[PDB]
Amino acid sequence: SAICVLEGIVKGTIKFEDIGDGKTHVSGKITGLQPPGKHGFHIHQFGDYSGGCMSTGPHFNPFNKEHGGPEDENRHAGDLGNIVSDDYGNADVNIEDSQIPLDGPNSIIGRALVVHQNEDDLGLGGHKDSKTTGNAGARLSCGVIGLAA
Amino acid sequence: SAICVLEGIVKGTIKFEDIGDGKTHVSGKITGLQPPGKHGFHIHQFGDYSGGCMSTGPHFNPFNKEHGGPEDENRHAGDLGNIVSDDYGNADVNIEDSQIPLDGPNSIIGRALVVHQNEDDLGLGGHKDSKTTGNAGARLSCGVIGLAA
Ligand SMILES: [Cu+2]
Ligand SMILES: [Cu+2]
Ligand SMILES: [Zn+2]
Ligand SMILES: [Zn+2]
């Protein structure tokens, strides 16, 4: 098991459980996520927010692919897609994925979870930065991913 | 390299560098650390502060020893001893140690750094809890230890 306490504007505790396989299940309640709609949600390379969310670096990309959506083969391991907030800024996270293991050479422990101001276009927006960040825009919050009981 | 952004009352960014060996060097500037004098400083088992610093659990103890000081053989790997704050609450951390590696089966990545209200008696206080926590008292702040560039 692993766990992430979000720091920044958007608040919440995100748990990670080996499910497993194979797959890990990521969940938790998020609040303060404005405006309502879809927001990019990604594991980034470094678990360092000493300099703000900017210091977590680029998307976690161990298999050296382009940015995509969680269902594409051509996809960063850290590409969890979008989560959705309602009119009050509340969101429930409930995602299953098989490129974010809790051990092994490509584990996510000690990396960072990041949630974004905009929708992640899943690499299909035809923007300058579509194929790297999904054009997801500003980093609202981040948390270091930690070993949990 | 690894890094810790302190959350709680006491503020600061603590860096961890393989030095190395062998040994890792831990440093950074801390503020808000009252009252002046010695405060226990320890790596704890879980990088989880979802429930407050309490959720980081006991001292990191991979080699299954009793609590001691950093120079004892009979010592938790997480036992970094005491740091010192001046009259204004400021402290400079500068410690070298060889039981807190940044990789391997006994790495500290994804665990937690914790700083305490009291002096750690290094297992010599003859208190109920001397040989487990050093009688270090309340957890003022904690940070998850993260992978850094
Ligand atoms: Cu991101
Ligand atoms: Cu401690
Ligand atoms: Zn990506
Ligand atoms: Zn100890």
Side-chain angles (χ1 to χ4, degrees), chain A residues 3 5 7 13 45-50 109-111 144-149, chain B residues 3 5 7 13 45-50 109-111 144-149:
Chain A
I3 189 167
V5 176
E7 302 285 348
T13 294
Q45 177 168 18
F46 311 108
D48 172 6
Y49 63 108
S50 60
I109 293 318
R111 304 199 188 260
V144 181
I145 294 152
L147 241 288
Chain B
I3 189 167
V5 176
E7 302 285 348
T13 294
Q45 177 168 18
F46 311 108
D48 172 6
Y49 63 108
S50 60
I109 293 318
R111 304 199 188 260
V144 181
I145 294 152
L147 241 288

Side-chain angles (χ1 to χ4, degrees), chain B residues 67-69 82 118-127 129-131 133-136:
Chain B
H67 184 84
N82 291 285
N118 311 327
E119 186 171 1
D120 176 334
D121 66 27
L122 311 186
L124 296 167
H127 279 279
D129 69 352
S130 264
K131 236 42 169 278
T133 68
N135 201 44

Side-chain angles (χ1 to χ4, degrees), chain B residues 40-44 59 114 116 136 139:
Chain B
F41 190 69
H42 305 146
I43 295 198
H44 287 228
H59 297 168
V114 171
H116 287 270
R139 303 164 188 207

